[model samples]
Target: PQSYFNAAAKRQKYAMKPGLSALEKNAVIKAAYRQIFERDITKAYSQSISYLESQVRNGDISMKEFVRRLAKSPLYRKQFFEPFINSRALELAFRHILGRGPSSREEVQKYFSIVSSGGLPALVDALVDSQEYADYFGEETVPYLRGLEHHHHHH
Candidate 1:
């Protein structure tokens, strides 16, 4: 968390500006690769940056959005959120994406209902298709365990 703003803020300056220079582009992409892939304990969401760069550079998306896209990719799932079901999948989403457990019985049951009916993709989409996700991470940053609301408890 120390480096979150300390280092990440300086990194943020490199992004969220305008078009990038060749050196800045390389630095930004490298930072996205390290932030999204290497920072995780296992260090393996996207092993390479081509996909992330191609997706963002083509559209001029921010490094933060770049990181989020990487996290939600099928590649991210292959190691992190895939191969699970029901409560396991639900819990993993909280742990990995939003970075917390279900804070209330109602919340758990809501996701449970989705996972039960809509399957994991729907469940994942439910998290992303909300105001919370947009407000949760800025265009200049990656997702992290930011903690909880009154209805949501991280610990």
Candidate 2:
């Protein structure tokens, strides 16, 4: 059997292209949702946005309907609400980073700066650099740390 990463890579490649059937699209969306949801430790369900965005981008969901449904969706509300109650810092950070929508490279850099160097930066760094972060994300925190460093340089 193919490795999970290989399977995911194949799926992602197919997802980026066009001409899938409705059933195929639904399967992809489900897969995306599962991946996002499972990756989230906080159980905040914020991955719903990424899943929905992926589905919409892949033409599984119409942009108009996506926006309409998203506005009223339980997933969206849950994602935002739980974070507000559980982590004000994360809520503020997410708002600050994503408030303007699809961020530019510079904007992303700026956001990472706030996460890595501001008054809260040390805390962010500690959390991200900890072994728990690596174990939770299933990867080294170096990339994230580097991104934070890049942000620091820009800001």
Candidate whose TM-score is highest: 1
**Model 2 spans > 4 angstroms off:** 1-11, 14-17, 35-72, 86-155
Per-candidate TM-score against the hidden true structure:
0.57, 0.29
Residue 139 lDDT, candidate 1, scale 0-100:
48
Candidate 1 per-residue C-alpha lDDT over 1-155 given as tens digits, one digit per residue, 9 for 90 to 100: 47555444442433434566667766656654554455633335334456656666654555444544665666655555466657887887666556677899999999989977876567666665445655544444434344321111112
Cα lDDT computed for each candidate against the true fold: 0.56, 0.38
The residue-by-residue lDDT of candidate 2 on 1-155, one tens digit each, is 26545344442322423576767655544443343232333346447666665666565654323333432355534554455532344344333222222246774455455534542433334333344323343221112111211111111
What C-alpha lDDT, on a 0 to 100 scale, does residue 25 get in candidate 2? Answer: 56
The alpha-carbon deviation from the true structure for residue 124 of candidate 2, after best TM-score superposition, in angstroms, is 22
User: What are the runs in model 1 whose C-alpha is more than 4 Å off?
Assistant: 1-49, 62-72, 78-83, 147-155
Which has the greatest lDDT?
Answer: 1
Shift of residue 108 alpha carbon in model 2, Å? 11
Candidate 1's displacement at residue 71, Å, is 4.5
Q: Where does candidate 2 clash, by residue pair?
A: none
Error of 1 at 141 (Å): 2.0
